[PDB]
Amino acid sequence: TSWSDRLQNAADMPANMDKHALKKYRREAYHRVFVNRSLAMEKIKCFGFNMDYTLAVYKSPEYESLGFELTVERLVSIGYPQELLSFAYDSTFPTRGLVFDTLYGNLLKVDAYGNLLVCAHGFNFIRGPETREQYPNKFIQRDDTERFYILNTLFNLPETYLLACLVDFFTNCPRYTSCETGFKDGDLFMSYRSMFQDVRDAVDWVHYKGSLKEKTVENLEKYVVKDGKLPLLLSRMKEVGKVFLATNSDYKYTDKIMTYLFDFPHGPKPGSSHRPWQSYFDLILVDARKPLFFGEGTVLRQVDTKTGKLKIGTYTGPLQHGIVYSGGSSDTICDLLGAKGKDILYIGDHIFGDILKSKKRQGWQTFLVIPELAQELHVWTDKSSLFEELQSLDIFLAELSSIQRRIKKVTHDMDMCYGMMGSLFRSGSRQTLFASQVMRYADLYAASFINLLYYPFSYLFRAAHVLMPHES
Amino acid sequence: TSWSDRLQNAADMPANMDKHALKKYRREAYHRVFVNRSLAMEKIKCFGFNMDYTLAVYKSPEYESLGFELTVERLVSIGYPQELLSFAYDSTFPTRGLVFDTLYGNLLKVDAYGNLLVCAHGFNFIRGPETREQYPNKFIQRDDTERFYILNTLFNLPETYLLACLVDFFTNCPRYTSCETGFKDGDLFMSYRSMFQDVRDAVDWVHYKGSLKEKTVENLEKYVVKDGKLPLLLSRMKEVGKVFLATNSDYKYTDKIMTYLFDFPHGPKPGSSHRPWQSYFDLILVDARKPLFFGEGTVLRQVDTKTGKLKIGTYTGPLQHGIVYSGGSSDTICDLLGAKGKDILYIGDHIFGDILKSKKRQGWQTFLVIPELAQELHVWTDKSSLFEELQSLDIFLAELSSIQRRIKKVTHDMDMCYGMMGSLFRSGSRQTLFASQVMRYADLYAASFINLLYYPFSYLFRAAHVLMPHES
Amino acid sequence: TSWSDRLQNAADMPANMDKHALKKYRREAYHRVFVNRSLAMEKIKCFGFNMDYTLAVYKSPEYESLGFELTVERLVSIGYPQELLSFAYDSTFPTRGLVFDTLYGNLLKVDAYGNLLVCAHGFNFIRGPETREQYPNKFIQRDDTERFYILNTLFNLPETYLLACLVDFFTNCPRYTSCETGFKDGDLFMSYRSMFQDVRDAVDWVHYKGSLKEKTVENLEKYVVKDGKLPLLLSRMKEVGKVFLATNSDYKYTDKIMTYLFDFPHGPKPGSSHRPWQSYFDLILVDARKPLFFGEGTVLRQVDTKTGKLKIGTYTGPLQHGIVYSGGSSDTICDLLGAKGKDILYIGDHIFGDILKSKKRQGWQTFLVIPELAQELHVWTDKSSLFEELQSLDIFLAELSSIQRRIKKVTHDMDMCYGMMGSLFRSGSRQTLFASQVMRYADLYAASFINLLYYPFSYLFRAAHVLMPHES
Amino acid sequence: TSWSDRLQNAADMPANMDKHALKKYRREAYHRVFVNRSLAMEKIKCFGFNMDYTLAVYKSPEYESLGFELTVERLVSIGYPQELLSFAYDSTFPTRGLVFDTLYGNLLKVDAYGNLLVCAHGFNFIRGPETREQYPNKFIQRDDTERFYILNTLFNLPETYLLACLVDFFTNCPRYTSCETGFKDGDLFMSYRSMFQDVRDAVDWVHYKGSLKEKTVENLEKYVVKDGKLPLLLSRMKEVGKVFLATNSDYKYTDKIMTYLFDFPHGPKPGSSHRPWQSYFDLILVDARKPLFFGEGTVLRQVDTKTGKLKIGTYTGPLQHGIVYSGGSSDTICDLLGAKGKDILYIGDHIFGDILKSKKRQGWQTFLVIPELAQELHVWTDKSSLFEELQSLDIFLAELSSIQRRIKKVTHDMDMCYGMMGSLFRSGSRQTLFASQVMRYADLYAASFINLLYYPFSYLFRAAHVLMPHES
Numbered sequence A, B, C, D: 001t002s003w004s005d006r007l008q009n010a011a012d013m014p015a016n017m018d019k020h021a022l023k024k025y026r027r028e029a030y031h032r033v034f035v036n037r038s039l040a041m042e043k044i045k046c047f048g049f050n051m052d053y054t055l056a057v058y059k060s061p062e063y064e065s066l067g068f069e070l071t072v073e074r075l076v077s078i079g080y081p082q083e084l085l086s087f088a089y090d091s092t093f094p095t096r097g098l099v100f101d102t103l104y105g106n107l108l109k110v111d112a113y114g115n116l117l118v119c120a121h122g123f124n125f126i127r128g129p130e131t132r133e134q135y136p137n138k139f140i141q142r143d144d145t146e147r148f149y150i151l152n153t154l155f156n157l158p159e160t161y162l163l164a165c166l167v168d169f170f171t172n173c174p175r176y177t178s179c180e181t182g183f184k185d186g187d188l189f190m191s192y193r194s195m196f197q198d199v200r201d202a203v204d205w206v207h208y209k210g211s212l213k214e215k216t217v218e219n220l221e222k223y224v225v226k227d228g229k230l231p232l233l234l235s236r237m238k239e240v241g242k243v244f245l246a247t248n249s250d251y252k253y254t255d256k257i258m259t260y261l262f263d264f265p266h267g268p269k270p271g272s273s274h275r276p277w278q279s280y281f282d283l284i285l286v287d288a289r290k291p292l293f294f295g296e297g298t299v300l301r302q303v304d305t306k307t308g309k310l311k312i313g314t315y316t317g318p319l320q321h322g323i324v325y326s327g328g329s330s331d332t333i334c335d336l337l338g339a340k341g342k343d344i345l346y347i348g349d350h351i352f353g354d355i356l357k358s359k360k361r362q363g364w365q366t367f368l369v370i371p372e373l374a375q376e377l378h379v380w381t382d383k384s385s386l387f388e389e390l391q392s393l394d395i396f397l398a399e400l401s402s403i404q405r406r407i408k409k410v411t412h413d414m415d416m417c418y419g420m421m422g423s424l425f426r427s428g429s430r431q432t433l434f435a436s437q438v439m440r441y442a443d444l445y446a447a448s449f450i451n452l453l454y455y456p457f458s459y460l461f462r463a464a465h466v467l468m469p470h471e472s
């Protein structure tokens, strides 16, 4: 059972909009919206979306596996060894939000301070004492962006696994000699940095020049979660405010995917006339180039929706019915919709490019979709005895080293329930960078934005006020 | 009763080192060390200090008043109007950590997200509706460092007040015409940005070229808190680890101030031989240039301690007894003391330059001194009925607008107990940027670092583990 | 008769290597090497080449016309209007080295100081008085690289003409309104800057992603000058020094073009065995990325010459027989050939990327190929009575305004003999930027590098010493 | 006889303004204006000046010696060794325009291409073969501004000599060990780069914080050339155009120096009323900050001429009688005087900051003052047999190595007639960087701007037109 199996199972159920049923449903963690800061929904005047991994949630592990295969094939076609063709995607290895250290070729799971929680070199998980040669303070400067790359999105899952596959391969293939910063093959030296760059380039290439989009659109039922409740929720949002789309994808791809998401023999409700996906938006903007979108952005262009090409010139006109925009900036949305930032709830899956940036640069209110939560919540509840034991052990230890061996063991067994790289949100009792960023920048979060359907228009989402230690 | 009166009253008391007395003393909030993240003191191998406003806590409001007067005098001497000489420092106006908006000439108190909590134009406190012309989303991009200046340190208190004095003066003096971004005096236009720069330049000048240091050292009892417990605590630290000083000040000034701080007719304890201040440090580093110190730093130099001048050349030698360093980097400390970052507890008063930077760049453990806490804690406890009422009102309102007028009123009355700009840490129920940064980057904090004297060597400082909303 | 007709006519003649015949031949300006600074050929130890427009001189106007057509087709395919398909390349319009002003949409011919010599808006040549609204000092800041683009190479001839075609089109098409900085088409505004960028992007696209290379290689006799004397001269160079190729082109294309250039039923001389083109080089380097090549360059890679793909990794080995390099830096050449800069004669056609940069950054000796000289020399000699009249008029005027109308007229008639944009090297008595840069950075220059064949190994190229006015 | 002795001897002579006398006088090279590009004086509408070393020509070697002494004293006061006090300025060592190589501690005299003409390490002049270890291609990348510093102005003569003194001292003092990039003194390493920076800082300090200005103004007759013909020429300029001053110096110093320059018991002519120096200018601008002045510049300020302080605010008014400006940009001059660049003749002594920048950035016409020419012209004429022999030897050698030993010897004997670093303009037959820059950027040049007095208002300065080798 993947997290997308969980999402599609809930997608298959029609909405029971009876008030009491809705209240009952949203008690379950799976259908809940979680609250980091209080938010009065009555004050939201605009609902903003992105498409990829928010409206269009790609099925797992099929879509990751497709991306992986195509990226591998691209590396082989540019000269990587034939053995890469024996690799096969393994969904049990990667967790999202890991950091690739391009100097030493390690995948690192870190906390908000850059402290090391896990370190894997290829598939070798390096124990604490042995990480000290390379990380003498068990720490990285995680904003040293020339050295460290943060794998934030679900699109980064294939490369997360591939990086580990490649380090493992070169390490164990006697044609190469392993060095601290890369591999020697006679008079050729491949640094981990250059290897990483090749992987990144190949992933970009697969998406923008290769066959990934074409292979996705030829089998949308295999690759994309589909939910009759989507048009219902968007139609309801439009009854109380404005609705917009700001996507990094292009118009041709957006139109294919969105047409699929709205392809039912009805509109918002069974029995209602089907309506084109575009009719659900007051403003549609493609090629957004987030995160630059939230600063200077790019020139505002108009899409010719017949051809899918941009009209020539910068668009200087007003918001009009049927127009589709390309590029621009977050100021375009505000200006054209007559909104200030706090009037907007932006619904994103990219912790950096959607959530952190809209919050910090523009003061937008935020909703983070975290698809893996659909399955992490099941693990959390099913294995809760392990976390609770860990908690008791931490308490007992603090109440002034056999206990320390036990803490490592329980931490490991708990973490393995999630995958080889553990929970998205923690390793044992230590929170991840990703968890910290979710708490700090996402006002609301959930396994799916669909969970807003279970709360009324006027709902006041509440979080407890925070007190400093000296105020308690 | 200023916060420095509180600190000096506690300074005047000799240490009662009986175990039970120490435990009893540190129960009181005034003598407590507060904990944001757990910290095992047994693991600290080095104790690091800065001097200004940490070891040498300048008395208030005398020292602020001196800085203010000298800065005013410098502005007049470069051509500002004679009316400035009628200004007098008012300690009830400024709170630390405000942001000066150089575009519109406002002092702003903001939360961690850049939301406006207070906005004052000169001495006019601008109500919420009226801030909307200049701040349509009641928000600033607080990292837009070309526009906004964050007044982080106690050295910034005089300029905080002076900026407000100047805006008030020019606004109400009929020689000038008030414009959105500055003042017109015939064919001269003074922007708030250029005014701010003149103030900043004059404060720097007073410190580095003018008479502030000379006037301070000629009356140290008036200007600097002095505590017989200082040598005691430093001597105890040196029994269990290494002790270092990294100060932005120069050696001549450092030697004058430190000699004063250690000028008692005894050493660590009454009855013990007096020892020179330098004997309390394994490493002494001046001209540190924090925050650059925590990145590339500057060339390591050696001070000639006879002359107070730098020896010519970069110092390439080892740590030796009696040597004093100048410049260098945080790596100098680690290398020469044989320490890794987590072995170090750095004791600072500069939330940005000492605490945030050492934590984020180097993974040092941190202790933030907050001198104002010595008096804010008294207000917090004495006026607790007001905060508690505010809390109940927030609860009652949330449990689904006469109440909203009451929330504004109680928020205002509470805030005024601290000063015209409120508590360092909050406005009503909203936490400040400074509070957020204290919680995020300072592992420990207190009104004085002296409060470490009341905890044993082995102490385990404990903070509760943090859970995400979906983990609760 | 195009300049390439002249070059191919001389190419068709076999070499008569008799000493007296060679001396006689090199007296004619067409077969001469011209000298800006003295150069002792005996001191040259390495001869360096580029390929495009040096070894491989594309035929004119056929190749320009092909580039033009394909660029037009690309613009139409991305949404430019269908009328562009009626454009046809006109070799009589563009001269090389013009500056496009992206603010006002003008092609400018300037001197070394940025003084305006010609200004054309579309096909409207703007008289002096009328240029003053846009250029009040008849001057541009020609290093303001964000505004001005210098069209240095023969590859830039199609876009030179196309830019003028586009400004003319939009100006005269009543669908658009002409503004100072671009064109309005309803709610779309196309700046001259964005138009320019589209043209530049389309030219790049045609070369790197489109069909230009494929169409060139399918008819090499139509598109590329071929000369049996090439292998002869390169073989002679190799008898007295080392020979290298540093080309911005890729290996696959290089191999196709070079194989064509050496495809004769003989090697260096008639009667000799044919040898592969690679055998004529001690070092072959592709993907050079000049001008970056002459600074930091890029990582040194090795080409797999079977596949045409790069081997994975940086190449750390020595110079070996049969190896082909990719990327690297000018230091690669020096290190691997055991050369210092003054030992190298680099033979280039790019005044900036080959000549100025190798001279200024590395102190290489330089030879500039200027293919248009093959026809400009004919005009210069045939119309010499016009220049001589201009000279006499300048003299007579200086010897203290009917004469000034005559100077404009004669200047215009002279310039028109070269084309609508005049000589590469001057407008009337004023030298162009290009001329100045040739004199300043090219030690030697000629219509073809083949002209070195007519000078012996030991030749001392001589230029007169320069004296300052006060030294004369 | 120094160059300033020559200038003051000519200064002492009253002007004979008879037409025939003026024509006769300007035939002599000493009183001539030299012409790099033709310039019609009738077209000049504004005459612009700088003060230091143009209007105010400091006497030599007295002023250099003063600067040297004060700089030495400053270095000793910050910790340099006492032996520096034994140094004494030697005017026979430095020539202007040398390059200090901060890596290897050499003074270099280079041509326009960065080729080495002379290399001195301290006072050791390094022969050609021995320069090859450090400069393998006898070349530097002279725009590598982090490594190389170009000593352009007469203010740089003291530091030119001091740098050589210091390298010599440390090299020969057995307390220090000489290394490739600096000197070791036990555990202190002084790089040539840090030494250079100390010298540069000390020269700045002497000028802006120390006693140089005060010592100059207390003995102006010792330190500043004074000429009754100055007011005459400026008065004549004002009869036919506008006159402005743009100086990097401050108003207080400018007023002292200018008052001295105009302190005669007459105005322009004997018998005429004395007039204040300010009356000779339509526009007076101080604190110009050239070269930044010719780009963005700084905020335009107004000087209070009573106090010498800046009025507070940016000056937004028109040009008015008696106003004095500070900061601004070259656009300030043009706007306020109603001039375009080619209407302006700017008279400067700084080849980079006055001449190159005004020409290249703004298209101003230029006049370079070169005070040393007043004595170099005497050497040039007196030792002309040596240059002529060198010329004949170059000719004879070229007409196909005993001759090469003779060329080195004659080159050396010629160069020594100018000083140990040779002529400003050449070493033997090779022109210097400075010479090249004079020819390229200075339209006119002379030993003094006073030489304009000897040419009528309408004069047409003529230079021969330049032809390319293929045009001859």
Ligand SMILES: Nc1ncnc2c1ncn2[C@H]1C[C@H](O)[C@@H](COP(=O)(O)OP(=O)(O)OP(=O)(O)O)O1
Pocket (backbone or CB within 6 Å): A142, A143, A145, A150, A152, A351, A352, A356, A360, A437
């Ligand atoms: N999730 C992320 N992915 C990629 N880059 C990130 C991410 N979070 C932060 N950064 C980058 C942007 C900045 O260059 C740098 C500063 O990060 P840091 O200050 O440590 O984190 P933060 O949570 O305070 O966010 P911010 O970066 O916006 O300040 O790190």
Ligand SMILES: Nc1ncnc2c1ncn2[C@H]1C[C@H](O)[C@@H](COP(=O)(O)OP(=O)(O)OP(=O)(O)O)O1
Pocket (backbone or CB within 6 Å): B142, B143, B145, B150, B152, B351, B352, B356, B360, B437
């Ligand atoms: N207290 C402060 N004083 C001055 N500048 C600050 C302060 N805090 C942050 N900055 C600056 C440094 C960066 O340019 C920018 C980024 O800040 P921001 O990311 O919002 O805060 P933060 O608490 O995440 O710290 P950081 O700046 O280190 O990421 O703001």
Ligand SMILES: Nc1ncnc2c1ncn2[C@H]1C[C@H](O)[C@@H](COP(=O)(O)OP(=O)(O)OP(=O)(O)O)O1
Pocket (backbone or CB within 6 Å): C142, C143, C145, C150, C152, C351, C352, C356, C360, C437
């Ligand atoms: N032919 C050219 N093509 C493109 N850019 C040029 C060319 N010549 C010079 N530049 C650019 C590089 C620099 O940014 C800037 C400085 O030019 P400038 O100093 O005026 O010319 P130059 O002949 O002295 O060469 P250089 O640029 O190398 O100094 O202009």
Ligand SMILES: Nc1ncnc2c1ncn2[C@H]1C[C@H](O)[C@@H](COP(=O)(O)OP(=O)(O)OP(=O)(O)O)O1
Pocket (backbone or CB within 6 Å): D142, D143, D145, D150, D152, D351, D352, D356, D360, D437
């Ligand atoms: N006389 C000088 N003094 C200081 N810097 C100089 C001087 N001449 C040139 N430069 C600097 C400015 C640029 O960074 C760099 C480029 O110089 P270069 O192109 O070789 O000389 P140039 O005579 O063509 O002038 P420019 O620098 O303006 O292009 O060198």
Ligand SMILES: [Mg+2]
Pocket (backbone or CB within 6 Å): A050, A051, A052, A053, A054, A348, A349, A350
């Ligand atoms: Mg997305």
Ligand SMILES: [Mg+2]
Pocket (backbone or CB within 6 Å): B050, B051, B052, B053, B054, B348, B349, B350
């Ligand atoms: Mg401090």
Ligand SMILES: [Mg+2]
Pocket (backbone or CB within 6 Å): C050, C051, C052, C053, C054, C348, C349, C350
């Ligand atoms: Mg080429």
Ligand SMILES: [Mg+2]
Pocket (backbone or CB within 6 Å): D050, D051, D052, D053, D054, D348, D349, D350
């Ligand atoms: Mg000057």
